[PDB]
Amino acid sequence: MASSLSTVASNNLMDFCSVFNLIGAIADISACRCERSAITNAFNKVIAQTTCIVPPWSEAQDDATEFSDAITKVEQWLKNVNEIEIGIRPSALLIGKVWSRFYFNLNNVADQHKTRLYRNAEHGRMASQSNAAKIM
Amino acid sequence: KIIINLFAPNLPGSTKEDDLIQKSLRDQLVESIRNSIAYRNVFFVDGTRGAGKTTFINSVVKSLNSVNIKCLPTIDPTKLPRHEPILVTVTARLNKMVSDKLKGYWASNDYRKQKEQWQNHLAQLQRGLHLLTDKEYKPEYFSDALKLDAQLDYSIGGQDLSEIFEELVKRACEILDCKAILITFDDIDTQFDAGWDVLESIRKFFNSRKLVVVATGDLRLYSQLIRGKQYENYSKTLLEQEKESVRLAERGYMVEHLEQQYLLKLFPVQKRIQLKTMLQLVGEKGKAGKEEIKVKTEPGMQDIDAIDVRQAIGDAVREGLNLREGSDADMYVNELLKQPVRLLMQVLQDFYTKKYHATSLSVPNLLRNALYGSMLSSIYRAGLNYEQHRFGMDSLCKDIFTYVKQDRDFNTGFYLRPQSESEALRNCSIYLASQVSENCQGSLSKFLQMLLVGCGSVSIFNQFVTELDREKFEQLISEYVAYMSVGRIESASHWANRCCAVVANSPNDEKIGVFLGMVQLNRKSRQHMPGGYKKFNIDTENGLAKAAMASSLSTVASNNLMDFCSVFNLIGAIADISACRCERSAITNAFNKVIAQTTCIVPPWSEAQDDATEFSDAITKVEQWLKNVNEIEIGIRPSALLIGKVWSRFYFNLNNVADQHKTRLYRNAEHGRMASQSNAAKIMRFNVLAFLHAVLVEESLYHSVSDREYIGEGLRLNPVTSVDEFEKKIKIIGEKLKADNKTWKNTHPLFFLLISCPILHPFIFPVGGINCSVKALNKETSFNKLIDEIVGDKLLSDEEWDYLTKNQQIFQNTITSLNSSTIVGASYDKDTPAR
Amino acid sequence: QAIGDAVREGLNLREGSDADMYVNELLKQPVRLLMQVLQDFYTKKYHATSLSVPNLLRNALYGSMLSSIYR
Ligand SMILES: Nc1ncnc2c1ncn2[C@@H]1O[C@H](COP(=O)(O)OP(=O)(O)OP(=O)(O)O)[C@@H](O)[C@H]1O
């Protein structure tokens, strides 16, 4: 979530969590693939080095062992992926198409779960109750 | 193997058999023409501007010089007399080698007959040459076309110079006992208008089978030449009468559709070859090298120790910019490889020649001179300062402002990232980074000025003045640069004294008198104030507290004089005290440089012990600090990315503090001990910490004196409310440096010097800003001893620190009364909610 | 089938409308432009076989409709 946790620097500190930054996280891990630096620095790329301002056109315990533990999991991920990722071949059509599948899925999920919040929906077990975690 | 000698003219005439950068293409093309003639036939090499064309096209002729093909000397369309048919110069060149053949062989019976046959066609061609130059038809010449010659067969009547030249070359081949004649052209980059006659003649007269043509030029430039000649066919009246966009669209398509196929008639697609750029030959870091290149950096070296080309640029980029070894340094060398070979070689030739000459002493100084001449054209296009001896931080800070407006990016503009769209801005970005690391090198006072007035002047305009169609935005920059005087700054403190006025004219919700990095101490007394709150008074403090408080002040005249407490002034003041050590009283003047003659004005864009030795002890502490910095000023090697990265962290960290500690004033701010309590002095303690914490993260992350960082694998944040996370960063770094057996000076020169400045000492531990709780002390007590570890001697007396922990004694290095001061608009009404 | 082996693997397409449309859009091209892009394949791929097949197509296309890029 830390990578997805983006803070908009303005007159008020506004913070957002988005699925795109999850997409934008994995899409950059495989770029370097080595040196144990880009992958480690990927976990902190918006904390203080990305302060987006609203556009002018608008109207406005120890974490030491757990940090090195989490890094090797994506290092575990890369060596298993690299043994098959060459045999697959995409193209123009069937890569734009899946985005339309993805883009419309986001719209429907956001629209439906927008009004599915209640005072007792936190970790709600009802098929209709929803919270912030249910959106994600 | 390629060995490039940098101490060589590198001209096309001074090439060798091993110094050729491109050899596979030279060899590969040679057999292709031979196989074509073994059993139109117009070749075409395609070359990026500066790839290497005239040198390359000379090598292929050399290969064909030693089936048998005879090659004519290379002809340059640019270096030819104007108003001269190109059929003439080919015939004249052809005649020379044929006339050399006739007087060569020994037999006389054939020579007397062969010469007569050769001259029969020359006279035929000469009398028919008037068609190429005449502007109008002569009715007399009709009787000349009707007259048929003898002994020669012409399948087509008339003049028809196409067959006459075709018959001429056929007889020219018999005398030269060859299979075909090689005609080679040259590039027309210098004047591409002259290249129109080349294309016109090739498609008309060189249509035989024993002629092979090898053109050369820039393909993207030929298209603009042909398209211009297509429009000349349309009648000018039609081109004006029918201006409808519906007709204009189809007219433009027809022109494009015509010359697209026209170029295919001249140069077939399968015949076109390209010259690979400098990048496509060596290859990137990840992939293997196709054809490696080794260069001779120093003169008179053995061929064994020849350095690679990438290491020959990393020797300059990494060292000339003081940029640490990493992927970011690879950004520049990758961009430099994509540049044309002619530009890249001249940059490499000049830098290494001067470095050897200097050795027989500043590396960035030698690189800056090389970059100035190379991209002088892009400097003039962008309008940057270009006078040689007017260099300095005053000009450089103006230069970086011009670049940002051109790039239209206020977020990463001061990073100087070569990622712009226009080629001119990319050249300016790399050039500016060279100048940033030249003046800033080996100086602390120069470093802060670049950070404060150079980088800072862009961020302030982005958020507070830009929000005030682009034509109106244009004059705002014009008067803003005049107001704050980016072109010429009298003192770093005066910029901060002007920075506050710029940002003060931007109110906020509920009009709390706290701003980005500053608070507004009330200059008067409001009736019936609760608790011990009162009006701020400088005379309450003593010793270093008054001196530190004197620097951190600024006033603005806005029909009622407003007082300001600032962090920017403290940053600027240090950049002035650390300027020159040759005088003692200068630092005393720096203490009260602005406190007396401020008289600041609202910007146009906005409508509205003994007193003899009172500071004697303060001067000694500052004077001792002068010896410490002056012995370390050599070590510091700031880069063009370090300063940009430091400021960005500062901007986010400082923006958070000024926002969270805004509603946290609930009548119990005075004598604050719990983290929820927050008074005016609490904000100022954190802002100074926000400056030093921002330096700590980026100093280790990016610096030329450290190969690897010592922060370690771990998430980083900013101390908005809690100093605990800032405490562990120093503790962890202290552990790592101990294992490597390294000191503090030779690893973090910036952090060590700032933390030892006597001026910043009192603001770290104020009276009313220190957090005191059950767990607040736990982190703070280690933090207090951690700061003592960095400095050689003890920071403060133990008893003084004890009083701050619990809740009379005089404080020399601690502010005593800023905590109780009020804030304009901060009407103390609510109460602290506790649970 | 001589354009089928030119788009299906040149553009990484399977048997379908897109592969058949691209043959049609390579058929609406003038015969002069159809030869050169087609000739570039079998001439170059014979040298390769004595791969970068989709890149080999882009090599042929670059010299095929180069001028329309400027529009
Ligand atoms: N073998 C080589 N080694 C190093 N640099 C070379 C080599 N061959 C060419 N160069 C570089 O290319 C330059 C030659 O220019 P180039 O061959 O691109 O001709 P041009 O300027 O386009 O042609 P012209 O002047 O005939 O119109 C040299 O000055 C040098 O900078």
GROMACS .gro file of N, CA and C in nm, chain B residues 46 219-221 223 227 231 251-257 259-265 269-270 272, chain C residues 29-33 35-37 39-40 43 47 59-60 62-71:
model
  144
  182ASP      N    1   2.181   0.546  -4.644
  182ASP     CA    2   2.103   0.640  -4.564
  182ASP      C    3   2.181   0.670  -4.437
  355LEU      N    4   1.778   1.100  -4.586
  355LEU     CA    5   1.653   1.065  -4.652
  355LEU      C    6   1.540   1.158  -4.610
  356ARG      N    7   1.536   1.197  -4.483
  356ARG     CA    8   1.429   1.285  -4.436
  356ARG      C    9   1.440   1.425  -4.494
  357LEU      N   10   1.554   1.460  -4.554
  357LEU     CA   11   1.571   1.590  -4.618
  357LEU      C   12   1.535   1.587  -4.765
  359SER      N   13   1.288   1.425  -4.892
  359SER     CA   14   1.142   1.431  -4.903
  359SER      C   15   1.093   1.575  -4.908
  363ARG      N   16   0.886   1.733  -5.232
  363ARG     CA   17   0.752   1.786  -5.208
  363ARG      C   18   0.741   1.931  -5.253
  367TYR      N   19   0.459   2.098  -5.575
  367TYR     CA   20   0.365   2.209  -5.571
  367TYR      C   21   0.384   2.305  -5.688
  387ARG      N   22  -0.582   1.780  -5.190
  387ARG     CA   23  -0.465   1.828  -5.262
  387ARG      C   24  -0.336   1.788  -5.192
  388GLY      N   25  -0.333   1.803  -5.059
  388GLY     CA   26  -0.215   1.762  -4.984
  388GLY      C   27  -0.191   1.613  -4.989
  389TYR      N   28  -0.298   1.533  -4.992
  389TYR     CA   29  -0.282   1.389  -5.002
  389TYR      C   30  -0.224   1.349  -5.137
  390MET      N   31  -0.268   1.414  -5.244
  390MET     CA   32  -0.217   1.381  -5.377
  390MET      C   33  -0.067   1.409  -5.388
  391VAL      N   34  -0.022   1.522  -5.332
  391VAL     CA   35   0.120   1.555  -5.334
  391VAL      C   36   0.199   1.450  -5.257
  392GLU      N   37   0.151   1.414  -5.138
  392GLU     CA   38   0.217   1.311  -5.059
  392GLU      C   39   0.214   1.176  -5.131
  393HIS      N   40   0.100   1.143  -5.192
  393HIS     CA   41   0.088   1.016  -5.263
  393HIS      C   42   0.176   1.012  -5.388
  395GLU      N   43   0.498   1.194  -5.444
  395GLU     CA   44   0.640   1.186  -5.414
  395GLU      C   45   0.676   1.063  -5.333
  396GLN      N   46   0.578   1.001  -5.266
  396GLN     CA   47   0.605   0.875  -5.197
  396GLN      C   48   0.645   0.767  -5.297
  397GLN      N   49   0.573   0.757  -5.408
  397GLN     CA   50   0.608   0.661  -5.512
  397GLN      C   51   0.725   0.708  -5.596
  398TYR      N   52   0.742   0.839  -5.612
  398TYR     CA   53   0.852   0.891  -5.693
  398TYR      C   54   0.986   0.848  -5.635
  399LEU      N   55   1.002   0.857  -5.503
  399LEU     CA   56   1.126   0.816  -5.440
  399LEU      C   57   1.151   0.667  -5.454
  400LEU      N   58   1.046   0.587  -5.474
  400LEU     CA   59   1.065   0.444  -5.495
  400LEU      C   60   1.120   0.414  -5.634
  401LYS      N   61   1.086   0.497  -5.733
  401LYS     CA   62   1.143   0.480  -5.866
  401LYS      C   63   1.294   0.502  -5.865
  405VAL      N   64   1.370  -0.002  -5.241
  405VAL     CA   65   1.371  -0.025  -5.097
  405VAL      C   66   1.477  -0.128  -5.059
  406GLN      N   67   1.485  -0.238  -5.133
  406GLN     CA   68   1.581  -0.343  -5.100
  406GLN      C   69   1.725  -0.300  -5.118
  408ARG      N   70   1.835   0.018  -5.027
  408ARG     CA   71   1.870   0.114  -4.923
  408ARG      C   72   1.939   0.045  -4.807
 1000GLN      N   73  -0.303  -0.201  -5.101
 1000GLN     CA   74  -0.183  -0.128  -5.136
 1000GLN      C   75  -0.155  -0.144  -5.286
 1001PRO      N   76  -0.090  -0.045  -5.347
 1001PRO     CA   77  -0.050  -0.060  -5.488
 1001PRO      C   78   0.048  -0.175  -5.505
 1002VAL      N   79   0.044  -0.237  -5.623
 1002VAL     CA   80   0.126  -0.356  -5.648
 1002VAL      C   81   0.274  -0.323  -5.638
 1003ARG      N   82   0.314  -0.201  -5.673
 1003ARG     CA   83   0.454  -0.162  -5.657
 1003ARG      C   84   0.495  -0.163  -5.510
 1004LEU      N   85   0.409  -0.111  -5.422
 1004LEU     CA   86   0.437  -0.112  -5.280
 1004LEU      C   87   0.416  -0.250  -5.218
 1006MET      N   88   0.498  -0.547  -5.365
 1006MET     CA   89   0.618  -0.627  -5.393
 1006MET      C   90   0.729  -0.597  -5.293
 1007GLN      N   91   0.761  -0.469  -5.274
 1007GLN     CA   92   0.880  -0.433  -5.197
 1007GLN      C   93   0.871  -0.481  -5.053
 1008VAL      N   94   0.754  -0.466  -4.990
 1008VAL     CA   95   0.738  -0.514  -4.853
 1008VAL      C   96   0.740  -0.666  -4.850
 1010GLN      N   97   0.886  -0.862  -5.091
 1010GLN     CA   98   1.019  -0.905  -5.132
 1010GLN      C   99   1.120  -0.893  -5.019
 1011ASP      N  100   1.102  -0.794  -4.931
 1011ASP     CA  101   1.196  -0.776  -4.821
 1011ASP      C  102   1.195  -0.896  -4.726
 1014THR      N  103   1.367  -1.229  -4.907
 1014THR     CA  104   1.508  -1.201  -4.930
 1014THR      C  105   1.586  -1.200  -4.799
 1018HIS      N  106   1.840  -1.508  -4.580
 1018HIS     CA  107   1.970  -1.482  -4.518
 1018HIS      C  108   1.969  -1.522  -4.371
 1030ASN      N  109   1.109  -0.372  -4.031
 1030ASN     CA  110   1.216  -0.333  -4.122
 1030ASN      C  111   1.162  -0.309  -4.262
 1031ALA      N  112   1.072  -0.395  -4.309
 1031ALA     CA  113   1.013  -0.378  -4.441
 1031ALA      C  114   0.917  -0.259  -4.444
 1033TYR      N  115   0.927   0.013  -4.264
 1033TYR     CA  116   0.995   0.142  -4.251
 1033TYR      C  117   1.029   0.198  -4.389
 1034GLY      N  118   1.079   0.114  -4.479
 1034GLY     CA  119   1.101   0.156  -4.615
 1034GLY      C  120   0.979   0.151  -4.704
 1035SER      N  121   0.864   0.110  -4.652
 1035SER     CA  122   0.744   0.093  -4.733
 1035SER      C  123   0.656   0.218  -4.731
 1036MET      N  124   0.611   0.260  -4.613
 1036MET     CA  125   0.530   0.381  -4.602
 1036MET      C  126   0.601   0.488  -4.520
 1037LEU      N  127   0.730   0.509  -4.549
 1037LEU     CA  128   0.810   0.605  -4.473
 1037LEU      C  129   0.754   0.747  -4.486
 1038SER      N  130   0.718   0.788  -4.607
 1038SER     CA  131   0.684   0.928  -4.631
 1038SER      C  132   0.555   0.969  -4.561
 1039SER      N  133   0.460   0.877  -4.546
 1039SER     CA  134   0.333   0.911  -4.482
 1039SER      C  135   0.349   0.942  -4.334
 1040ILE      N  136   0.463   0.906  -4.274
 1040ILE     CA  137   0.487   0.939  -4.134
 1040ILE      C  138   0.496   1.090  -4.115
 1041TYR      N  139   0.556   1.159  -4.211
 1041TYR     CA  140   0.570   1.304  -4.200
 1041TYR      C  141   0.435   1.375  -4.203
 1042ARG      N  142   0.335   1.315  -4.267
 1042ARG     CA  143   0.203   1.377  -4.271
 1042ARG      C  144   0.141   1.383  -4.132
   0.00000   0.00000   0.00000
